[PDB]
Amino acid sequence: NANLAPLPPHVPEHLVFDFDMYNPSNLSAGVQEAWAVLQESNVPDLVWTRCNGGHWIATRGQLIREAYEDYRHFSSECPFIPREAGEAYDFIPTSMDPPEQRQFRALANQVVGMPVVDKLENRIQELACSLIESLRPQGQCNFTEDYAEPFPIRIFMLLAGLPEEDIPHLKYLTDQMTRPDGSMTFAEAKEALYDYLIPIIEQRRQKPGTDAISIVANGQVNGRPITSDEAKRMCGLLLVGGLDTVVNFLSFSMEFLAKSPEHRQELIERPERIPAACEELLRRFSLVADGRILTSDYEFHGVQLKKGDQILLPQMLSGLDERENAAPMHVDFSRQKVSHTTFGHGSHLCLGQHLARREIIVTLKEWLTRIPDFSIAPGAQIQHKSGIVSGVQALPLVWDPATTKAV
Ligand code: HEM
Ligand SMILES: O=C(CCCC[C@@H]1SC[C@@H]2NC(=O)N[C@@H]21)NCCCCCCNC(=O)[C@]12C[C@H]3C[C@H](C[C@H](C3)C1)C2
Ligand SMILES: [K+]
């Protein structure tokens, strides 16, 4: 038993492609590369894999977008593979469908959407600068550990009005959930995280301030007050949603720049291209793959899907699709129409996308200004990991500090 689930009778054999989203066979060549094997010409647009309990995978942008739009057939009630993890998952609004999702989404948007971002730009700037300056004269760092991890969690603490001293504890709680070693069930990891949040929400419903947790926990949904349980489930997501996505995305980006002096030089000589370069990086190193559960039997693009079937709808694949972007594996900061679904698509389109772009942009601007020349540490083989949010296990970087400048 290679732990492949028995093929359900409604699934025709010609659609079977046993891709393992947690351990894809081509991983050492890069995680995007490993997933992009689903886009080779003999692979159908929609396939069934017997790995991880058995589930569909939409392999092309067209189908990915369509399924993300159609929440009536493709429900977020069970958004993760394997089924047991999807079933346990209760974060808001990511575990809900419209119409109920819409009210909770509007509340979340108050704490992370556009006007909040335009406002936070300078605390973001300060944080990046102080982290980079602490590393600069060392001539080395573990980028994932020393910059990518501390950065988003500190921004979240700021949004949420949580004290600095809580960072290590909260880092520990979130790592438990998002990088499981198998010592804990997903529901157990969630519970530990909730145990931290339960008291703070209680406190802030009694005595609200103007932080994100206070806005959320005292908000109105469908014309009534939000429950303490709902507030907890939203805060959980606002905490985690901006963590591993940003940590891992920044690591993919920095790994690419470390290996590409010419792309570094382009952005050094033309810093105005940094916003467009962020978008082209978001496409090439897209990293999320969640999904949906069928609400009923449904024929979708010629394939019979059954009520209860899970479907993986990898956000990462759309922008890598040759049918969406010519020469997809190639990074071109002057690509003219960069299409991707890196932030998702449809009713759940990332609410933190504006904050995420500021984090990436500030990072690239501030890093390249201080440390224009860096490389992968000699002889290091960069290891990737695949999953719901794919990523980089560690990123040792080296530079000559004489080539750097303190601003
Ligand atoms: C590179 C960074 C990021 C990526 C790639 C990303 C990706 C995504 C994706 C793909 C979804 C949709 C999931 C689905 O349809 O099931 C999503 C939703 C969400 N994201 Fe992000 N995200 C990022 C950063 C952030 C940040 C910094 C925050 C701030 C807390 C955040 C907050 C949220 C929230 C609240 C939702 C749920 C929206 C809803 O369900 O209506 N994200 N994100
Ligand atoms: O629950 C999981 C998956 C289980 C991984 C273990 C598998 S099972 C068999 C196999 N063998 C092994 O040794 N291991 C594997 N952890 C993954 C992390 C769960 C993260 C939950 C929190 N994140 C979120 O809610 C999200 C929601 C949404 C927006 C953001 C990006 C993405 C979409 C995830 C944040
Ligand atoms: K669920």
Query: Which ligand is in closest contact with the Cα of 116?
Result: 1
Alpha-carbon span 219 to 97, nearest angstrom: 19
Q: Taking the alpha carbons of 37, 42, 47, 52 in that order, is the dihedral positive or negative?
A: negative
The one-letter amino acid at 128: A
Peptide bond into 99 cis (omega under 30): yes
Q: Please tell me which residue in 59, 178, 245, 404 is annotated as part of the active site.
A: 245
Task: Give residue limits of the domains in the chain.
Answer: 1-407
Q: How far apart are CA 55 and CA 84, in angstroms?
A: 13
Tokens of 35: 């997933």
Separation of 352 CA from ligand 1 center, angstroms? 6
The angle that helices 353-370 and 274-284 make with each other, rounded to 10 degrees, is 120
**Which member of 352, 358, 363, 387 is catalytic?**
352
Pick the atom of ligand 2 nearest to 388's CA: 17
Q: Which ligand is nearest to the CA of 352?
A: 1
Mutate to test the pocket of ligand 2, among 51, 95, 389 (most ligand atoms within 8 A of CB): 389
Residues around ion ligand 3, judged by CB within 5 A, are: 89, 95
Cα 176 to middle of ligand 2, angstroms: 11
Reference 7, options 35, 42, 48; nearest CA is 48
Residues shown for the chain: 407
Q: How many CB atoms lie within 10 A of CB 240?
A: 20
Atom of ligand 2 nearest to the CA of 237: 25
Cα of 23 from ligand 2 centre, angstroms:
13
Cβ atoms of residues 58 and 21 within 8 Å: no
Rounded Cα gap, residues 144 and 253, in angstroms: 11
Give the separation between CA 70 and CA 188, rounded to whole angstroms.
Answer: 32
Phi, psi of 57 (to 5 degrees): -135, 125
d(CA 72, CA 58): 17
Q: Report whether 374 contacts 400 (CB < 8 A).
A: no
Method used to obtain the model: X-ray
Q: CA 384 to CA 251: how far, in whole Å? A: 10
Residue 343 to residue 333: CA distance in whole angstroms: 19
| 349 alpha carbon – ligand 1 mean position (Å) | 7
Q: Give the C-alpha distances (Å, rounded to integers) separating 407 from 148, 360, 395.
A: 21, 19, 24
- Dihedral (Cα; 282, 162, 209, 111), 10-degree rounding: 10
| SS3 labels along the chain | CCCCCCCCCCCCHHHECCCCCCCCCCHHHCHHHHHHHHHCCCCCCEEEECHHHCEEEECCHHHHHHHHHCCCCEECCCCCCCHHHHHHCCCCCCCCCCCHHHHHHHHHHHHHCHHHHHHHHHHHHHHHHHHHHHHHHHCEEEHHHHHHCHHHHHHHHHHHCCCHHHHHHHHHHHHHHHCCCCCCCHHHHHHHHHHHHHHHHHHHHHCCCCCHHHHHHCCEECCEECCHHHHHHHHHHHHHCCCHHHHHHHHHHHHHHHCCHHHHHHHHHCHHHHHHHHHHHHHHCCCECCEEEECCCEEECCEEECCCCEEECCHHHHHHCCCCCCCCCCCCCCCCCCCCCCCCCHHHCCCCHHHHHHHHHHHHHHHHHHCCCCEECCCCCCCEECCCECEECCCEEECCHHHCCCC
Q: Which CATH code is given to the segment(s) 1-407?
A: 1.10.630.10
Is 350 part of any known ligand binding site? Answer: yes
